[PDB]
Amino acid sequence: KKILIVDDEKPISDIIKFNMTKEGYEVVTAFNGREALEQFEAEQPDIIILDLMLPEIDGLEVAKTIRKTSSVPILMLSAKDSEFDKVIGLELGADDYVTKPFSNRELQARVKALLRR
Ligand code: BEF
C-alpha cells in the first residue's frame, strides 16, 4: 500500500516515513499543499497523512480539494488540536485527526484501521 505524507517540517516527515517504511508501506512525501495535490494526482496513494499548517495551500484546502474527486482516506496530523480544528477537519472530509506530538505506534494503528475501512 502507498502512503503520501504531507508535512513542511522535514524532521517530522522523516520520522513518519521511517515508521511507515518499517511497516512495509511505500512512502511518497510532499512539503507543501501544492506538492500535496501534485503527488496525490501523480502517485494515487492509498492513504494520505495530512499536516494543516503548510506553505502555498493549507491542509484544510488540500483536503477539500481532494474530496471533489476522491474518497481516498485522509488522516489529518497537526499541532492544531482545538475542538474547532478537529471538527472542521472531519467535516471537510478527513476520516481521522491526530494531534502532535503523536505516538508512532498509535499512528501506525490508525493507518491500519483506516485502510481496513
Ligand atoms: F503544521 Be501541522 F498543522 F502541524
Ligand SMILES: [Mn+2]
Ligand atoms: Mn506544518
